[PDB]
Amino acid sequence: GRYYRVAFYGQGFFEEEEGKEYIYKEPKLTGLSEISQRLLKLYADKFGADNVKIIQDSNKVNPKDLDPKYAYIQVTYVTPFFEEKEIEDRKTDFEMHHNINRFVFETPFTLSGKKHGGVAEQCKRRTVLTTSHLFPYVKKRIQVISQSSTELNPIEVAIDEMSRKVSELNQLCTTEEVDMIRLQLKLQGSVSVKVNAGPMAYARAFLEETNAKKYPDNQVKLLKEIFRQFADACGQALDVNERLIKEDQLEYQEELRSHYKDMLSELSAIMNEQIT
Amino acid sequence: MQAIKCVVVGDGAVGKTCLLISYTTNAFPGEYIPTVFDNYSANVMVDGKPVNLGLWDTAGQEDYDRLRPLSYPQTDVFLICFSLVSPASFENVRAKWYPEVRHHCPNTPIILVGTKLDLRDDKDTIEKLKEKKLTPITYPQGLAMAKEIGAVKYLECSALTQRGLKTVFDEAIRAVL
Secondary structure, rough: EEEEEEEEEEOOOOOOOOOOOEEEEEOOOOOHHHHHHHHHHHHHHHOOHHHHHEEEEOOOOOOOOOOOOEEEEEEEEOOOOOOOOHHHHHHOHHHHOEEEEEEEEEEEEEEOOOOOOOOOOOEEEEEEEEEEEEEEEOOEEEEEEEEEEEEEEEEHHHHHHHHHHHHHHHHHOOOOOHHHHHHHHHHHHHHHOOOOOOOOOHHHHHHHOOOOOOHHHHHHHHHHHHHHHHHHHHHHHHHHHHHHOHHHHHHHHHHHHHHHHHHHHHHHHOOOOOOO | EEEEEEEEEEOOOOHHHHHHHHHHHHHHHHHOOOOOOOOOEEEEEEEEEEEEEEEOOOOOOOOOOOHHHHHOOOOOOEEEEEEEOOHHHHHHHHHHHHHHHOOOOOOOEEEEEOOHHHHHOOOHHHHHHHHHOOOOOOOHHHHHHHHOOOOOOOHHHHHOOOOHHHHHHHHHOOOOO
């Protein structure tokens, strides 16, 4: 199913649930608005709709921020969390769905206090919540009894996002039957970004030699290598898309190849390596 | 798993990336994890069945007019987005987006989406719009536009409150299946 963190804060409202935090287990592909509205309704029936509020912020709640005139329900989507030692022993999807008591979500933050910033300023927390019992369970929810967190600095976020893009594009290219619409969606969103900052935004924030050195050389080293792999994985996905496209997507493909080649040119100048 | 290509179009700053990020990552807009990449996917349970929904997030500004249609081949359904508190984006549904889609895709189903529902009733938004002698787009006017441009659905939503958000992408899939 789908798992949600729900936490209750409402001194003159909740009883047993007050101060508590749970992982709710929802039906397959249930969305955030479907559980938020139900919870909102369910507790609006106990306390009155005017007195119940959702907390969208996923950072740990500080009760000093809450109006004592309202009960509050914090809701946040979480996913089953496994470390690399667990991910090897667990085999099937049924094994990722069974006997699980840890769950992860991510929070955006910057060291200025702002939640969101450009790539050179944007950090990310990973909070792992642990329940008192393993799922599946007789109950719909299980109390969270501990939490653990790590944070990523901007270049660690850059490393993390670029590394997963490599693995994604690599995976698409070696699946037996490739879903063309999925391949182009991630290909065009890699070599041809126009709304968001673009993968080159990481290269310019961290790999340029005309920036003030700010990050360990070993991390700058590793981000460079990942970018070399990214440029590789773009060219392979590009060529796979060559074989798949019909005549209606010749001009779109050639436009994707021209954006790819500009990207590799710009990367080449920043890294002082000729890239592909 | 059947993949569906849905292409989202509209003026800049009507909320499209926010909607798509919020929806596909299952997060409230305030907590979205920024991404340097474009476009999004999601697995939606529609009428009991799970389907893959590839969402193309296109740049609506004039400097992108000539290349954006290269994204239109193989589309199953379009979303033409405007903002309910931006009368100017609502007029560009008729002045620009409707003609562009049909000038390229004569028979692809269009869904007309009014975004930022929460701000139509917002006092500050009203008062700022009133300052320019404008006023939010009502539901009747959005429906009237939906009729003039032949969209199969008219939909209003708000990434912040999540109202009507599940429905937009359910209908995007139902217009294809």
